[PDB]
Design a protein around this ligand. Structure first.
Ligand SMILES: CCCCCCCCCCCCCCCCCC(=O)OC[C@H](COP(=O)([O-])OCC(O)COP(=O)([O-])OC[C@@H](COC(=O)CCCCCCCCCCCCCCCCC)OC(=O)CCCCCCCCCCCCCCCCC)OC(=O)CCCCCCCCCCCCCCCCC
Ligand SMILES: CCCCCCCCCCCCCCCCCC(=O)OC[C@H](COP(=O)([O-])OCC[N+](C)(C)C)OC(=O)CCCCCCCCCCCCCCCCC
Ligand SMILES: CCCCCCCCCCCCCCCCCC(=O)OC[C@H](COP(=O)([O-])OCC[N+](C)(C)C)OC(=O)CCCCCCCCCCCCCCCCC
Ligand SMILES: CCCCCCCCCCCCO[C@@H]1O[C@H](CO)[C@@H](O[C@H]2O[C@H](CO)[C@@H](O)[C@H](O)[C@H]2O)[C@H](O)[C@H]1O
Ligand SMILES: CCCCCCCCCCCCO[C@@H]1O[C@H](CO)[C@@H](O[C@H]2O[C@H](CO)[C@@H](O)[C@H](O)[C@H]2O)[C@H](O)[C@H]1O
Lengths: 149, 49, 82, 97
C-alpha cells in the first residue's frame, strides 16, 4: 500500500528530512570528541575557504629584483623572510599602490619602486587586473624593481 | 557462515593488523571492559547492588 | 570494503567530495553576480557593461581598461563621448 | 628608431626605394609587417574554421558467445563500497585486507 489519503508527498519529504537530521544529531552526539569536531567543522571549513578563494578570486606570483628591496618581516610571525614566487590573492579593485603597500606591510617602501610583467612597466594609478589582462594575459608573474635609470 | 564470521572479526577486532581499530581515545563499552577488567568488576557490583 | 588497488579512487573521493559544497557555492555566487549585473544594466548605465567579463571599471571618468578617459574635460553636443 | 642600418627588420621594402609604382596600393611598407599574420592576407573565415566538425567513426559492437565458455572470469573492483561502513571509510580506507 503506497501512499495514504489526505497526506502529501511534500509532507513525507519533510518527515524524511527530519528523520535524517535527527539521526545525524544522534550519531554526532555518540561519537568521539577527538575526531568529530575536526572532521566535521575544521577540514570542511578550510577546504571551503581554499576552494572558494581559488575558484573566485584571482592571484599573482610576485617576485622582487634585488634582496635590498625585500621587505622587513622579522617582527611578524610565521614568516620571518621574503621568498620569491609567493602566490598573492587580490581583489579586482586593487591598484599597484595598494599592492605595494600590502607587500611592504604599510611601511615606507624604497624610492622609485615599480611593477612589471613580461618586461612592461605598470603605472601606479592602474588596476592590476586590467594591466595584467593587457600586458601579460594568463601570465600574472609580477616583478618589483627599482626604476632609477 | 565461517567466511562471514572471519570477515567481521578481521574488520572489527582489536589486533596487530587492525582495520577499524584506529584513532581510539574514547572507547566503547565492550572494548573498555575488555581492556580494563578492574572497572568491569566495580561497575558490575555497583549495578547489582 | 577497500583494497590497495582502490587507492586512486579513495584518494580522489576523499579529496574531491568535500569540495562539492564549495563548487555549488561558487556556482550560486556566480548566478547572483550575474543577476545583480543584469539588474544594474536594466536600471541603466552611462557606459555599457560587458556581462561575461571579470571586471567593468568604466564610468564617466574612466575607460573600459581602468585608465582616465581622453578628451573628457569638456562637454559635447552629441552628449557622451561613447 | 636608433640604429637604422643595423636594424633591417624595421626598414622599408626594396620596392619603396624605387620611386615608381579606384584606390591604389600603399607606396611605403616595412619589413616588420612580416611579423604579423593577417597583415597582407585577409582575415576571412578567421573564426569559422574551428567550426567545421566531423563525427567519430567507432562502432561498439562485439558478439558475445558464452556457449563457448563454462568457467567464470575475474573482474575488477572500480570503486570502494560506500554503502557499507560509510561513517568509518576515512578511518579504514588506508588499510589493506
Ligand atoms: C557547512 C558545514 C558543512 C559540514 C556538514 C554540515 C551538516 C550538513 C548536512 C550533512 C552533510 C554531511 C552528509 C554526510 C552523509 C553521508 C555520510 C555520513 O556522514 O553519514 C553518517 C550518518 C551515520 O551513519 P551510521 O551511524 O554509521 O549508520 C546509521 C545509518 O546511516 C542510519 O540510516 P537509517 O537506518 O535510519 O536509514 C537508512 C539510510 C541509509 O543510509 C546509510 O546508512 C548509507 C547511505 C549510503 C551513502 C552512500 C550512497 C552513495 C551511492 C552513490 C549514488 C549513486 C546514485 C546512482 C544514480 C543513478 C540513477 C540514474 O537511508 C537513507 O536515508 C539514505 C538516503 C540517501 C541515499 C540515497 C542513495 C540513492 C537512493 C535514492 C533514494 C531516493 C531518494 C530518497 C527517498 C526518501 C524520501 C525522500 O549517516 C546517517 O545518519 C544517515 C545517512 C545519511 C543520508 C544523507 C543525509 C542527507 C545529507 C545531505 C547532504 C547535502 C550536503 C550539501 C549541503 C549544501 C551545501 C551547499
Ligand atoms: C533529479 C535527478 C534524480 C536522479 C537520481 C535519483 C533517482 C531518480 C528517481 C527519483 C529519485 C527520488 C526517488 C524517491 C523515492 C522515495 C519515495 C517515497 O515514497 O519515500 C517515502 C516518502 C515518505 O512517505 P510518508 O512516510 O510521509 O508516508 C507514507 C508512509 N508509508 C511509506 C509507510 C506508506 O514518500 C513521499 O512522501 C515522497 C518522497 C519522494 C519525493 C521526494 C524525492 C526525493 C529526491 C530529492 C531528494 C532531496 C529531498 C529534498 C527535496 C527538497 C525540495 C525543495
Ligand atoms: C560519484 C560519487 C560517488 C561517491 C558518493 C558521494 C556521496 C557519499 C560520500 C560519503 C563518503 C564519506 C562519508 C564519510 C563521513 C565521515 C564523517 C564522520 O563520520 O565524522 C566523523 C565522526 C567520528 O565518529 P567516531 O570518531 O566516534 O567513530 C568513527 C569511526 N571510528 C570508531 C573508527 C573512529 O563520525 C560521527 O560520529 C559523526 C558522523 C555524523 C555527522 C555527520 C556530520 C554532520 C553533523 C551535523 C550535526 C551537527 C550537530 C552540532 C551540535 C553541536 C552540539 C553537540
Ligand atoms: C545557505 C545559502 C548559501 C549559498 C552559498 C552562497 C555563497 C556563500 C559565500 C559568500 C561569500 C561572499 O563574500 C564575498 O565574496 C566575493 C567573491 O569572493 C568577494 O568579492 C571579491 O570578488 C568579487 C568578484 O570580483 C568582487 O566583489 C571583488 O573582486 C572582490 O570584492 C567579497 O570580498 C566577499 O565579501
Ligand atoms: C541560489 C542560486 C541558484 C542556485 C543554482 C546554482 C547552479 C548553477 C550551475 C549551472 C552551471 C554554471 O556554469 C556557468 O556559470 C554561469 C552561470 O551560472 C555562466 O557564466 C557566464 O554567465 C554568467 C551570468 O550569470 C556570468 O556571471 C559569467 O561571468 C559568465 O562566465 C555560464 O554560462 C555557466 O555555464
Amino acid at each position: 500500500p503506497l501512499g495514504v489519503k489526505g497526506r502529501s508527498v511534500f509532507a513525507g519529504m519533510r518527515s524524511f528530512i527530519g528523520q535524517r537530521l535527527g539521526r545525524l544529531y544522534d550519531s554526532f552526539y555518540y561519537s568521539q570528541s577527538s575526531t568529530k569536531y575536526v572532521m566535521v567543522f575544521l577540514f570542511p571549513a578550510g577546504i571551503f575557504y581554499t576552494r572558494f578563494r581559488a575558484d573566485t578570486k584571482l592571484g599573482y606570483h610576485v617576485f622582487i629584483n634585488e634582496e635590498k628591496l625585500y621587505p622587513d618581516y622579522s617582527q611578524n610571525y610565521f614568516d620571518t623572510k621574503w621568498t620569491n614566487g609567493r602566490k598573492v590573492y587580490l581583489d579586482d579593485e586593487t591598484t599597484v599602490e595598494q599592492l605595494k603597500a600590502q607587500i611592504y606591510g604599510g611601511k615606507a617602501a624604497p624610492e622609485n619602486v615599480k611593477v612589471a610583467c613580461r618586461g612592461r612597466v605598470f603605472e601606479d594609478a592602474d588596476n592590476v587586473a586590467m594591466a595584467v589582462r593587457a600586458f601579460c594575459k594568463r601570465d600574472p608573474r609580477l616583478l618589483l624593481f627599482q626604476d632609477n635609470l | 557462515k565461517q567466511a562471514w564470521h572471519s570477515r567481521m572479526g578481521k574488520f572489527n577486532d582489536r589486533s596487530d593488523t587492525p582495520m577499524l581499530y584506529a584513532y581510539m581515545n574514547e572507547l566503547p563499552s565492550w572494548e573498555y571492559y575488555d581492556l580494563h577488567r578492574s572497572a568491569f568488576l566495580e561497575h558490575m557490583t555497583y549495578f547489582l547492588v | 570494503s577497500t583494497s590497495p588497488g582502490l587507492a586512486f579512487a579513495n584518494l580522489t573521493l576523499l579529496l574531491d567530495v568535500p569540495q562539492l559544497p564549495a563548487i555549488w557555492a561558487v556556482n550560486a555566487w556566480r548566478e547572483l553576480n550575474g543577476l545583480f549585473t543584469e539588474m544594474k544594466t536594466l536600471a541603466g548605465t552611462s557606459d555599457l557593461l560587458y556581462p561575461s567579463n571579470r571586471y567593468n571599471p568604466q564610468n564617466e571618468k574612466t575607460n573600459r581598461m581602468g585608465r582616465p578617459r581622453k578628451y573628457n574635460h569638456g562637454e559635447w553636443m552629441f552628449g557622451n563621448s561613447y | 628608431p636608433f640604429m637604422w642600418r643595423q636594424r633591417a627588420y624595421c626598414a622599408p621594402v626594396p620596392s619603396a626605394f624605387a620611386s615608381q609604382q579606384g584606390v591604389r596600393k600603399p607606396l611605403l611598407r616595412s619589413n616588420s609587417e612580416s611579423l604579423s599574420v593577417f597583415s597582407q592576407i585577409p582575415d576571412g573565415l578567421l573564426g569559422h574554421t574551428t567550426s567545421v566538425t566531423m563525427g567519430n567513426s567507432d562502432i561498439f559492437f562485439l558478439p558475445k558467445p558464452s556457449n563457448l565458455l563454462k568457467i567464470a572470469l575475474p573482474a575488477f573492483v572500480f570503486m570502494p563500497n560506500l554503502t557499507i561502513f560509510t561513517r568509518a571509510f576515512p578511518f579504514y580506507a588506508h588499510t589493506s585486507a
